[PDB]
Write an enzyme that holds these catalytic residues in place. Structure first.
Site, PDB file in Angstrom:
ATOM      1  N   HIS A   4     -36.058  11.364 -55.618  1.00 33.49           N
ATOM      2  CA  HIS A   4     -36.031  11.958 -56.948  1.00 33.49           C
ATOM      3  C   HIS A   4     -34.801  11.479 -57.719  1.00 33.49           C
ATOM      4  CE1 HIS A   4     -38.890  15.601 -56.065  1.00 33.49           C
ATOM      5  NE2 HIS A   4     -39.447  14.425 -55.832  1.00 33.49           N
TER       6      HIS A   4
ATOM      7  N   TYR B  81     -37.012  15.081 -47.903  1.00 35.45           N
ATOM      8  CA  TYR B  81     -38.008  14.026 -48.065  1.00 35.45           C
ATOM      9  C   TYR B  81     -37.753  12.947 -47.017  1.00 35.45           C
ATOM     10  CZ  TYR B  81     -39.744  15.813 -52.584  1.00 35.45           C
ATOM     11  OH  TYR B  81     -40.306  16.591 -53.573  1.00 35.45           O
TER      12      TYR B  81
ATOM     13  N   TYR C  56     -40.079  28.536 -43.092  1.00 36.74           N
ATOM     14  CA  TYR C  56     -40.663  27.819 -41.966  1.00 36.74           C
ATOM     15  C   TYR C  56     -39.927  26.534 -41.623  1.00 36.74           C
ATOM     16  CZ  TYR C  56     -42.847  25.342 -45.877  1.00 36.74           C
ATOM     17  OH  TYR C  56     -43.094  24.643 -47.037  1.00 36.74           O
TER      18      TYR C  56
ATOM     19  N   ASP D 101      -7.898  15.242 -36.465  1.00 33.35           N
ATOM     20  CA  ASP D 101      -8.448  15.469 -35.135  1.00 33.35           C
ATOM     21  C   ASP D 101      -9.052  16.859 -34.941  1.00 33.35           C
ATOM     22  OD1 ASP D 101      -8.889  13.998 -32.664  1.00 33.35           O
ATOM     23  OD2 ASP D 101      -6.873  13.138 -32.948  1.00 33.35           O
TER      24      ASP D 101
ATOM     25  N   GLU E 200      -8.187  19.796 -37.203  1.00 30.65           N
ATOM     26  CA  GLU E 200      -8.001  20.678 -38.348  1.00 30.65           C
ATOM     27  C   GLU E 200      -8.474  19.961 -39.597  1.00 30.65           C
ATOM     28  OE1 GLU E 200      -3.942  19.889 -37.290  1.00 30.65           O
ATOM     29  OE2 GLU E 200      -5.380  18.224 -37.433  1.00 30.65           O
TER      30      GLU E 200
HETATM   31  O1  LIG Z   1     -45.196  21.654 -51.420  1.00 30.08           O
HETATM   32  C1  LIG Z   1     -45.951  20.452 -51.359  1.00 30.08           C
HETATM   33  C2  LIG Z   1     -45.093  19.285 -50.911  1.00 30.08           C
HETATM   34  O2  LIG Z   1     -44.276  18.899 -52.039  1.00 30.08           O
HETATM   35  C3  LIG Z   1     -43.481  17.735 -51.773  1.00 30.08           C
HETATM   36  O3  LIG Z   1     -42.769  17.425 -52.919  1.00 30.08           O
HETATM   37  C4  LIG Z   1     -42.514  18.007 -50.615  1.00 30.08           C
HETATM   38  O4  LIG Z   1     -41.597  19.030 -50.980  1.00 30.08           O
HETATM   39  C5  LIG Z   1     -43.297  18.438 -49.373  1.00 30.08           C
HETATM   40  O5  LIG Z   1     -42.394  18.797 -48.334  1.00 30.08           O
HETATM   41  C6  LIG Z   1     -44.208  19.629 -49.707  1.00 30.08           C
HETATM   42  O6  LIG Z   1     -45.021  19.942 -48.586  1.00 30.08           O
END
Ligand SMILES: OC[C@H]1O[C@@H](O)[C@@H](O)[C@@H](O)[C@@H]1O
Length: 752
Positions: free
Chosen positions: A221, A230, A290, A490, A492
């Protein structure tokens, strides 16, 4: 037996795990019982009458992409439970016919060539649904009449007839055209899918826009860091398609395919931590219940296992070692718990193979310059740093997703330790989105999604071991500007802020941290050696604080110390926060169930309309109260400078000096002098050698950066692009940063 026939059986095995799948396996057993159970609930309350105006009541609406797409996924799940060995619904002919009838019903009432190829949401009609359909087609191939199969594959060819997009989308078309090609045995189309992978955003590295970058970054994008979002999809799709074609007439032959191997080493591995894919590169997907970090991480490892099946040595073997390590590292959520049965089969074969040893854990610093991200990996902890600039946007929020991601990439620090659950278990829907760790903001006020106005965002890497980063802050939504820097050593991490000025008329604050606590919210914590109250719902101000210690959620390996050079005043509160995923993901399928998590939040209040304010704090991962106390007494770091012009820190024990120069004027920090905007880090070995790394974070300097080091040298060795013009009495050299794209240049000097 056709070749296509062979490919089809190959894909079917990738879906079911083949006939070899051993149902006796404890984990394979669980995966199938769950599949069968789900398939039942679906089949059970499915509308079978020919009068039906929908398949599932809860999903009615032949015009809603979401619903339709969801209906196909369910059918897909049912088809799998009917073709996966071990499933109680395996072979069940009735189930098979019901699926097929439902498919016919859909072709008539909702999915056919009489619809707009571009009707919102286009993704569902052209990619989402076809992918599910092909899978069913392949799984029920034998039981599908030529008549039905026509109405199935013709519609698909309608929506997606070719490949011509970029990144994840182009890859998706590729898998859609390709799998359909195998089913309708079309050699042209299939050859078309194989070739699609050589397109934009996939095999060939990108120099701008979508795709993978030579430095390991991944953009989608146009302006978002997306390796874990993506990017995950591109990896999964590309791996699945390459494996299918591998060893056949249409096997991939493009030389660039070797870049895929590098993706795993430079793009993914560094961003994985004990099973989790860092949220900072998942974009708007962090709002999906999910798909929390470990779930996503499992998906990435599943792809690595897939690649290991046909990857050439040494890659194949190395992939196996990496997968084996991650599977053993993730004690939070079982890897076998949420990947395909075939993946489980293949994975077990690796984990039980004694000749295969776990890969070593990464230990490094890496600057993902193309996507304004940086990551530090050490034994016992990892630090992720999300930034934004004129090149990368603050955050993405489309389709009602990620509505509160405002500051997730605005100088946000993400700490990873033994508490592998920190960012999972409903962190995102409950955390105070206005107080993202490490950020400086106007209290309870949001910012817009978009690119910034400063190009100074990035940092330098010293031999991939240590590093420094910086971000020139200036929000558009309201008046607030500041210089933010981070120095990674290292054990911190030093965070510095200066030039904090605003006219917004709103209180300004810098969030030191905001950690999710344990179930009781009773984590112990100390300040200057004094035990602090642990009760929930208590807000309290700690004045004149030098150090703070916070016990982690695990017995060991998750404690965090905070040291404040020169003392600080902290605003804190320990509270139980409630929220719902629906709040940050307002889509149908999102659960509106309320959840409650506990937090310990600490910030520095800079007041209203501050002028040239500043801050300085050090993160001390995995130290005990005593250790942090000792550290504060005799600190290893030392602040060299913290002005709006230059911020520099020194690490006395390692001999490291880092400096971020904010202006194009001659400035000096300790032994370093720069004439332009730059990120510099040096390491001195008493009377032996001096090492230096320099970078132009703006990626806009068309000339050079002139550096001068206050030391006398006898000789040198340097990366091409560096010209040493003097070694004595002081060192002087220039760096050709023209078109460098934020990379670091290294030089090594031999000291008198
Ligand atoms: O939601 C439909 C579809 O859209 C796309 O742009 C992505 O974000 C996918 O991961 C998603 O499954």
């Amino acid at each position: 037996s056709d070749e296509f026939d062979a490919l089809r059986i190959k894909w079917a095995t990738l879906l079911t795990g083949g006939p070899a799948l051993d149902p006796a396996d404890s984990d394979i057993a669980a995966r199938t019982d769950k599949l069968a159970q789900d398939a039942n609930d679906y089949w059970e309350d499915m509308d079978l009458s020919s009068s039906r105006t929908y398949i599932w009541y809860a999903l009615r609406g032949n015009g809603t992409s979401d619903n339709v797409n969801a209906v196909y996924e369910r059918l897909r799940t049912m088809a799998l439970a009917a073709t996966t060995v071990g499933s109680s619904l395996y072979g069940n002919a009735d189930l098979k016919e019901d699926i097929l009838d439902a498919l016919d019903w859909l072709y008539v009432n909702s999915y056919n060539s009489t619809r707009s190829r571009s009707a919102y949401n286009w993704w569902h009609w052209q990619l989402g649904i076809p992918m599910s359909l092909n899978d069913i087609a392949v799984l029920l191939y034998d039981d599908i009449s030529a008549a039905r199969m026509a109405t199935y594959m013709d519609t698909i060819d309608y929506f997606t007839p070719s490949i011509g997009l970029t990144g994840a989308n182009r890859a998706w078309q590729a898998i859609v055209v390709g799998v359909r090609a195998v089913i309708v045995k079309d050699a042209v189309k299939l050859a078309a899918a194989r070739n699609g992978l050589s397109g934009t955003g996939i095999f060939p590295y990108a120099t701008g826009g979508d795709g993978f970058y030579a430095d390991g970054s991944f953009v989608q994008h146009t302006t978002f860091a997306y390796t874990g979002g993506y990017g995950s999809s591109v990896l999964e799709t590309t791996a699945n398609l390459m494996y299918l074609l591998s060893g056949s007439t249409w096997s991939v032959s493009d030389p660039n395919q070797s870049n895929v191997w590098q993706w795993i080493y430079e793009a993914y591995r560094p961003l994985l931590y004990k099973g989790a894919m860092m949220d900072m590169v998942r974009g708007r997907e962090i709002s999906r219940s999910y798909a929390q970090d470990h779930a996503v991480g499992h998906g990435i490892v599943a792809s690595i296992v897939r690649l290991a099946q046909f990857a050439p040595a040494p890659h194949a073997a190395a992939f196996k070692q990496i997968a084996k390590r991650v599977i053993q590292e993730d004690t939070f959520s079982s890897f076998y718990g949420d990947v395909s049965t075939d993946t489980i089969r293949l994975a077990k074969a690796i984990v039980d193979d004694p000749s295969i040893a776990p890969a070593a854990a990464p230990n490094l610093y890496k600057q993902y310059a193309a996507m304004d991200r940086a990551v530090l990996q050490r034994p016992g902890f990892a630090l992720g740093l999300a930034l934004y600039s004129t090149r990368i946007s603050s955050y993405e929020s489309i389709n009602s997703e990620n509505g509160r991601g405002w500051y997730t990439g605005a100088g946000a620090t993400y700490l990873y330790n033994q508490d592998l659950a920190q960012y999972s278990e409903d962190y995102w829907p409950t955390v105070d989105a206005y107080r993202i760790p490490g950020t400086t903001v106007a209290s309870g006020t949001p910012i817009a999604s978009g690119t910034g106005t400063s190009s100074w965002t990035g940092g330098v890497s010293l031999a991939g071991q240590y590093g420094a980063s910086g971000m020139d802050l200036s929000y558009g939504a309201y008046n607030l500007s500041a210089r933010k820097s981070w120095f990674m050593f290292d054990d911190e991490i030093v965070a510095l802020g200066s030039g904090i000025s605003s006219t917004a008329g709103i209180p300004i604050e810098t969030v030191v941290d905001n950690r999710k606590l344990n179930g009781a919210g009773d984590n112990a914590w100390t300040a200057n050696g004094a035990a602090l109250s642990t009760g929930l719902g208590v807000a309290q101000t700690l004045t004149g604080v030098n150090w703070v210690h916070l016990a982690g959620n695990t017995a060991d390996g998750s404690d965090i110390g905070y040291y404040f050079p020169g003392g600080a005043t902290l605003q804190t509160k320990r509270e139980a926060r409630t929220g719902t995923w629906k709040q940050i993901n307002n889509r149908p399928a999102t659960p509106s169930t309320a959840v409650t998590r506990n937090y310990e939040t600490m910030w520095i209040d800079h007041g209203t309309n501050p002028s040239g304010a500043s801050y300085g704090y050090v993160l001390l991962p995995n130290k005990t109260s005593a250790q942090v106390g000792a550290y504060a007494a005799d600190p290893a770091i030392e602040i060299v400078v913290n002005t709006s012009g230059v911020q520099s820190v020194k690490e006395k024990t390692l001999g490291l000096v880092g400096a971020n120069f904010w202006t194009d004027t001659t400035q000096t920090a300790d032994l370093i002098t720069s004439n332009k905007k730059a990120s510099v880090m040096t390491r001195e070995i008493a009377d032996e050698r001096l090492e230096a790394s320099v970078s132009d974070p703006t990626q806009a300097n068309n000339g050079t950066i002139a550096i001068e080091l206050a030391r006398s040298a006898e000789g040198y060795s340097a990366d091409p692009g560096i010209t040493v013009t003097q070694l004595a009495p002081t060192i002087k050299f220039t760096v050709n940063v023209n078109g460098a794209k934020g990379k670091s240049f290294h030089a090594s000097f031999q000291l008198g």
